[PDB]
């Protein structure tokens, strides 16, 4: 499941760096980034369907690889706190992406 593990790593890394990029749009000309994020979340839905639990067993085991790509533990804990306040957890993260995509 090494391809599966690096896919989850890239999913969390791109989720965090799209959270950072949409911070300008969320806090009130970035419509190019909005349609790009919509195409990105549709691509991730299609890729998850091409492939096809809880946070503390499944999302918390890809901490090291994602944190080598990113190196900011506070952003990881903000992501985890937002998913904890929202509620396998892949469906939870994708539902979070759909709810952020429409707004």
């Amino acid at each position: 499941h090494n391809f599966f593990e690096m896919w989850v790593t890239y999913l969390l890394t791109e989720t965090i760096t799209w959270k950072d990029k949409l911070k300008t749009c969320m806090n009130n000309e970035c419509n190019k980034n909005c349609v790009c994020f919509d195409k990105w979340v549709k691509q991730k839905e299609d890729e998850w369907n091409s492939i096809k639990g809880n946070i503390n067993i499944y999302f918390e085991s890809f901490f090291f690889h994602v944190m080598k790509k990113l190196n900011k533990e506070a952003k990881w804990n903000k992501l985890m706190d937002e998913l904890r306040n929202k509620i396998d957890a892949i469906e939870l993260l994708l539902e979070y992406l759909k709810e952020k995509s429409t707004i």
């Epitope: 593990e5 790593t9 918390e60 085991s61 890809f62 901490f63 090291f64 690889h65 944190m67 080598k68 190196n71 900011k72 533990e73 506070a74 804990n77």
Partner: antibody, heavy 124, light 99 residues
Framework: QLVESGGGLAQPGGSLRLSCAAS????????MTWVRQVSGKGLEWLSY????????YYSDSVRGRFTISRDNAKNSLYLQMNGLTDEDSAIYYC??????????????????????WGQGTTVT | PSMSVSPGQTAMITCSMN????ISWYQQRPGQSPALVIY???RRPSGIPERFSGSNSENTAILTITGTRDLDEADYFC???????????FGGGTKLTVL
């Protein structure tokens, strides 16, 4: 369970090596840590090594002065020192680095913590 | 520093580091190696009871010990992390005196 050897007495100078062998643990895919502790004082992290032994971190006082390398076959980790002074008289605990280590991306965070601490040997 | 806390009450041990990292805690029995108590700021391994609780909010790491016992005489160290210098920052530790 961690077993230790190599501690004792040292004059100022170098050439003193400790050993720590991991018994009953999965030494191949876990990180490994050594932390010293002066008696009556607190902990002080010195060196860390990843699962694949391709990355290693050190403190600001022991970087380059100390060295560390692991043998994944016999499951024994050594710590080698040079230039010992009077401030290095501490209790050196060999520590299993907590977590699971996907590939060699290991670093001793407080996230996974440092789960298993050995008994350690006294360095004078 | 230290806090003289009577047995059975709540101890509030703070490091209050400005940069956020996941803070672990260790119960160092005297003459004994430390052991992992709380990791990922909420979680806890098997073999230790539920009474050790922790959190880190508003840049302050609080290890809430509910029901402090005589066996809790230990120096409790924060385990930080600094990704800028790649060196872990152990806390100074507090001699949590149990009366």
């Amino acid at each position: 369970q961690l077993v230790e050897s190599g501690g004792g007495l040292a004059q100022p100078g170098g050439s003193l090596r400790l050993s720590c062998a991991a018994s009953g643990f999965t030494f191949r895919d876990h990180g490994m840590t050594w932390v010293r502790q002066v008696s009556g004082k607190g902990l002080e992290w010195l060196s860390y090594i990843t699962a694949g032994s391709k990355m290693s971190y050190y403190s600001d006082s022991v970087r380059g002065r100390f060295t560390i390398s692991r043998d994944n076959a016999k499951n024994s980790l050594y710590l080698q020192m040079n230039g010992l002074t009077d401030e290095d008289s501490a209790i050196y605990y060999c520590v299993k680095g907590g977590g699971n280590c996907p590939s060699d991306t290991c670093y001793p965070s407080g996230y996974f913590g440092l789960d298993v601490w050995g008994q350690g040997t006294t360095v004078t | 520093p230290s806090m003289s806390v009577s047995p059975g009450q709540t101890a509030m041990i703070t490091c209050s580091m400005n940069k956020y990292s996941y803070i672990s805690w260790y119960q160092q029995r005297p003459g004994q190696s430390p052991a992992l108590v709380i990791y990922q700021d909420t979680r806890r391994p098997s073999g230790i009871p539920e009474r050790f609780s922790g959190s880190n909010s508003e840049n302050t790491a609080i290890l809430t010990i509910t029901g402090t016992r005589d066996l809790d005489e230990a120096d409790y160290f924060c385990q930080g992390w600094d990704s800028n210098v790649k060196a872990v920052l152990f806390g100074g530790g507090t001699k949590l005196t149990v009366l």
